[PDB]
Every structure is written in C-alpha cells, then in structure tokens.
PDB file of C-alpha atoms in Angstrom:
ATOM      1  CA  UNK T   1     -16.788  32.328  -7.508  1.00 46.52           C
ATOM      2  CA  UNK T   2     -17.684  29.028  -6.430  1.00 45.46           C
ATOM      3  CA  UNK T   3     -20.158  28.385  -8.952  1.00 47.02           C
ATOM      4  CA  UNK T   4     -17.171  28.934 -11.678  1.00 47.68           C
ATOM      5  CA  UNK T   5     -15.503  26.457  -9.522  1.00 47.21           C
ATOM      6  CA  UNK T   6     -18.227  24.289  -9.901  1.00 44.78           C
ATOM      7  CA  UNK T   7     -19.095  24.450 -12.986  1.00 47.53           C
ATOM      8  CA  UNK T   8     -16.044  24.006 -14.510  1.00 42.20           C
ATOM      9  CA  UNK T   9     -15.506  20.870 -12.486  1.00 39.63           C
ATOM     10  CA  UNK T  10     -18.910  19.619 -13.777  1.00 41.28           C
ATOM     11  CA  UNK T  11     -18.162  20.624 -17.344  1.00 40.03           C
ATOM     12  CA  UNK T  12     -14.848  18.607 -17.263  1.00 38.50           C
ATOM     13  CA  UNK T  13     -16.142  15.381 -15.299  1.00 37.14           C
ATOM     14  CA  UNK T  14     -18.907  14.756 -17.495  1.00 38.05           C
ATOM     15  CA  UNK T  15     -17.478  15.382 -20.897  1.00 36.14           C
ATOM     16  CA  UNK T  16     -14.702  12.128 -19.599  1.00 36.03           C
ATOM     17  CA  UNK T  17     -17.577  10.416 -17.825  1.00 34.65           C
ATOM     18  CA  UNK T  18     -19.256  10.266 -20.871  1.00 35.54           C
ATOM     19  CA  UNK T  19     -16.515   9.563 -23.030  1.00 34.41           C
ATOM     20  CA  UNK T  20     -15.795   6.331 -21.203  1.00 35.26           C
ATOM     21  CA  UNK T  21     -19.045   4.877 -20.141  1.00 35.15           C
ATOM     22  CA  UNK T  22     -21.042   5.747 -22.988  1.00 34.65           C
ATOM     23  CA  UNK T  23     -23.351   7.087 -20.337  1.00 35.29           C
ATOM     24  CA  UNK T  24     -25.857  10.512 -19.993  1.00 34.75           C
ATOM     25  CA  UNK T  25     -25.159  12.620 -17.342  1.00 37.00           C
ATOM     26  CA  UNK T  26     -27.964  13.286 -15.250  1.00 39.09           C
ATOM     27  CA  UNK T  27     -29.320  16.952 -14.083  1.00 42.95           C
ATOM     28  CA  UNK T  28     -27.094  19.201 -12.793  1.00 43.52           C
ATOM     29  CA  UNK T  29     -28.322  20.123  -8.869  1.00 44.91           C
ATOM     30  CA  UNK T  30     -25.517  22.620  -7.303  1.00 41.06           C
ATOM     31  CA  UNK T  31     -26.860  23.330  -4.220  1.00 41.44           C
ATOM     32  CA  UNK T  32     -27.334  19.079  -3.827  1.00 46.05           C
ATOM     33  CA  UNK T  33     -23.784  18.525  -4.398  1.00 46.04           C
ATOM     34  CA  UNK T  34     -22.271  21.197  -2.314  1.00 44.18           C
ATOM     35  CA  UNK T  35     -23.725  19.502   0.570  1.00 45.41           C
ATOM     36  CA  UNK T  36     -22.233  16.105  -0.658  1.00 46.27           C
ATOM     37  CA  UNK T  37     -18.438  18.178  -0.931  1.00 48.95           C
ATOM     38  CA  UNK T  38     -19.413  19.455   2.629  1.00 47.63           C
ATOM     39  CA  UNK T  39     -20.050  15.842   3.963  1.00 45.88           C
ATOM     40  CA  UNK T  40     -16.379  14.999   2.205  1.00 47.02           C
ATOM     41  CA  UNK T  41     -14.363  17.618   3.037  1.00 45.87           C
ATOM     42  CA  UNK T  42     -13.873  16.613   6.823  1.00 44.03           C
ATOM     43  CA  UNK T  43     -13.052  12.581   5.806  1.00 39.19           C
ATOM     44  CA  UNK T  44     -10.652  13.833   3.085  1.00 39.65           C
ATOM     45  CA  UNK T  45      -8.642  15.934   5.760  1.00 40.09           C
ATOM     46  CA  UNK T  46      -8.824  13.047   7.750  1.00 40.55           C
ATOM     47  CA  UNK T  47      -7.702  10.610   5.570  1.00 43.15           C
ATOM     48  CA  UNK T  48      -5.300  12.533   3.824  1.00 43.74           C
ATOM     49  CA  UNK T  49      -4.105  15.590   5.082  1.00 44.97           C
ATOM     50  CA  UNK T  50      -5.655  19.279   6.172  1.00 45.81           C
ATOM     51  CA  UNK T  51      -7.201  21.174   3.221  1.00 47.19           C
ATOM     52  CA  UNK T  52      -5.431  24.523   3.425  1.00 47.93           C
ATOM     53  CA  UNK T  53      -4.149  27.014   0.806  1.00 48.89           C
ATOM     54  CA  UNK T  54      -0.710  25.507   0.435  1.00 47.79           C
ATOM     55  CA  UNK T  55      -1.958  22.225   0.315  1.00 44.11           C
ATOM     56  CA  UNK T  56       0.490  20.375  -2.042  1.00 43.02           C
ATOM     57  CA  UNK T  57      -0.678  19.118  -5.744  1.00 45.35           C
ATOM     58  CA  UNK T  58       0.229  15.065  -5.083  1.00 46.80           C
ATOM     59  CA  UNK T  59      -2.250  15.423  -1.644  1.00 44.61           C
ATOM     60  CA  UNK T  60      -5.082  16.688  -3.828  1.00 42.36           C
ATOM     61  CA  UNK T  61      -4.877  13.760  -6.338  1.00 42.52           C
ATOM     62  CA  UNK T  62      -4.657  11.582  -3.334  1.00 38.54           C
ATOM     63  CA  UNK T  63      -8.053  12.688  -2.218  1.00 39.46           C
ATOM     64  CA  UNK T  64      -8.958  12.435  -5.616  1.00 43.00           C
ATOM     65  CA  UNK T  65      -8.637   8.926  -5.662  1.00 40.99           C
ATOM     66  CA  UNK T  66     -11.572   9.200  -2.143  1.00 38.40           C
ATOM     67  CA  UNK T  67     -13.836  10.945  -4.821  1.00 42.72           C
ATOM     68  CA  UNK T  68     -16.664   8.817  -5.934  1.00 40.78           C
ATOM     69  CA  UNK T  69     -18.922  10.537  -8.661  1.00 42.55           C
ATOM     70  CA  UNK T  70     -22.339   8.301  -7.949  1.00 40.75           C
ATOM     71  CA  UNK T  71     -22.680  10.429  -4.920  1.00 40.41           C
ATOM     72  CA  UNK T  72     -23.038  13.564  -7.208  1.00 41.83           C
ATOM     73  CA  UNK T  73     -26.290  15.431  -8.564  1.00 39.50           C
ATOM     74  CA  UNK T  74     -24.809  14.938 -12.388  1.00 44.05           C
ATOM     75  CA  UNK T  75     -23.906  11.416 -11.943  1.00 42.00           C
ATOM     76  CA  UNK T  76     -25.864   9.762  -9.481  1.00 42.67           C
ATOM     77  CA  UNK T  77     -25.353   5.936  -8.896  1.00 44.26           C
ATOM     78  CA  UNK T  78     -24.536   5.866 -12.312  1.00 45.39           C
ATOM     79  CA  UNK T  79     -21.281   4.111 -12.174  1.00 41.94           C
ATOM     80  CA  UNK T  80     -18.101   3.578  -9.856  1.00 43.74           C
ATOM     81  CA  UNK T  81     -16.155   6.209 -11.117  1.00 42.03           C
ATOM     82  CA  UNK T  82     -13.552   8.383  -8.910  1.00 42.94           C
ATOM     83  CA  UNK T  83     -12.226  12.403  -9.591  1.00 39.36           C
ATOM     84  CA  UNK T  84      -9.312  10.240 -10.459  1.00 39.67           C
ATOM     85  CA  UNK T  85      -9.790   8.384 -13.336  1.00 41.32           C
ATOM     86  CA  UNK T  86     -11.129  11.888 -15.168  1.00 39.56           C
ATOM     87  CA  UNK T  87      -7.709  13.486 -14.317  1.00 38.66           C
ATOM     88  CA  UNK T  88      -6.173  10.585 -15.632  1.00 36.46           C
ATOM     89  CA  UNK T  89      -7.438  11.514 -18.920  1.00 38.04           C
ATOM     90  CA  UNK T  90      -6.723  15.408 -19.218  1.00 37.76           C
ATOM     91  CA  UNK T  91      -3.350  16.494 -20.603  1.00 36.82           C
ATOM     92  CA  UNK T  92      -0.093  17.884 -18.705  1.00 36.97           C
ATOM     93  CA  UNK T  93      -1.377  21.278 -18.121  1.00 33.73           C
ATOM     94  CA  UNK T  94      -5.243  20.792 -17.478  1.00 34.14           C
ATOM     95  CA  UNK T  95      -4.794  17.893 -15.098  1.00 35.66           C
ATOM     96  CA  UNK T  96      -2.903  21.052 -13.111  1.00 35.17           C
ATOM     97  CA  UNK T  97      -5.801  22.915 -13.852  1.00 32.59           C
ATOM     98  CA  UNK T  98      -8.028  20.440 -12.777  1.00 34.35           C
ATOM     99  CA  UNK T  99      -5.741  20.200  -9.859  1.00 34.27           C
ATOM    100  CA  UNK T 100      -6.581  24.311  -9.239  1.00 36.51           C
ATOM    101  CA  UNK T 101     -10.568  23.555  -9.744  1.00 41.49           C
ATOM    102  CA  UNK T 102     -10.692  20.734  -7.216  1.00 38.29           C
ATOM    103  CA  UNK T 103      -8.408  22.367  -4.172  1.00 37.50           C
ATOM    104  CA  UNK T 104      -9.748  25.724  -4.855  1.00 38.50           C
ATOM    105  CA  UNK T 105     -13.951  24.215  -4.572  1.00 38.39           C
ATOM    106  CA  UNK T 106     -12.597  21.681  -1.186  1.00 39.56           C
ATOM    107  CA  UNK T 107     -11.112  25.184   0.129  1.00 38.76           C
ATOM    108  CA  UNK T 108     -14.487  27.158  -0.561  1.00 35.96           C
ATOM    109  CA  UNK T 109     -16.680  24.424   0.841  1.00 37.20           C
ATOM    110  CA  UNK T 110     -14.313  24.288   3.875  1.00 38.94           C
ATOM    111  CA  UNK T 111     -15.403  28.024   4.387  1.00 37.10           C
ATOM    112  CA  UNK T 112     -18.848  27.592   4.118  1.00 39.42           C
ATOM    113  CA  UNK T 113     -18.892  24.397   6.765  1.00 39.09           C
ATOM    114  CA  UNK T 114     -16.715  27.219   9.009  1.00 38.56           C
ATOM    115  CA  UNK T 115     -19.386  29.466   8.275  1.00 34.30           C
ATOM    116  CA  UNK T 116     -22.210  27.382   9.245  1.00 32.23           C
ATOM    117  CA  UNK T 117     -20.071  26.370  12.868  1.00 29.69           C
ATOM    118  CA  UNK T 118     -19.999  29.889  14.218  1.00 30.80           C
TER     119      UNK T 118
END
C-alpha cells in the first residue's frame, strides 16, 4: 500500500516539477527515499505537530512547506523546490488528494521507524 502511496506522490511531483523548471526528473529509487521520509518524519512532528491519523489538513501543508524535493531519489539536488509549491498548482479537489497521499505515506513511514525501534 505504500508503494501506491508512493508512487502516486512521485507521479504528481514530477509531472509539476517538470512543468515549472523545464527540468528531467531523475531515476526513481523507492527504497532511497523512504529512508529520506524516515529521517523527516521525526523533525516534521517536531516542528509542526505529531503525525497521527486525525492529523488536521492545514498541519500537513504546513509540513509541506519543510519538504525539500533535492533530497529525493527523483529529484536530487536538482532545484530548491518544496511539496508546497506542487500543491500550489493542483486544483480544489486533488490538492485534498494530495493532502490524503502525503499524510497517509508520513503515517506509513512513521510505522515502519516504530517498527524498526522495537
């Protein structure tokens, strides 16, 4: 289920990415960037606020605004971009979409780094 997650997240960033850098994505590397999301997820519920299930939509934009995509397999050091600026671009209903993807991949990431600690 995560890989959905994921993929759909990928499919979405780099189809804006490219749209407003006039930039190729790089490869794709899953198992990479899960370990960058688990290296996030603990700042983010510092900075912002726990990651739970009822985590509220206006918190998860916040963090999206943390997000940097030059950190990630598909868009490495290619340019400054945040999560942000691609929900910025997607319409009413997919930014809550998007929205879904992003808190539903922190919340599955969350379980592995739980996983891993016991």
């Amino acid at each position: 289920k995560l890989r959905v997650l994921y993929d759909e997240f990928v499919t979405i960033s780099k189809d804006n990415l490219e749209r407003e850098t006039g930039l190729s994505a790089s490869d794709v590397d899953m198992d990479f960037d899960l370990n960058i999301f688990m290296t996030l997820v603990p700042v983010l519920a510092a900075a912002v606020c726990a990651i739970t299930p009822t985590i509220e939509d206006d918190k998860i934009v916040t963090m999206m605004k943390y997000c940097s995509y030059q950190s990630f397999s598909f868009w490495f050091l290619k340019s400054g971009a945040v999560v942000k600026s691609v929900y910025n671009k997607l319409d009413y209903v997919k930014k809550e979409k998007f929205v879904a993807t992003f808190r539903d991949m922190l919340l599955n990431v969350q379980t592995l780094i739980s996983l891993n600690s016991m």
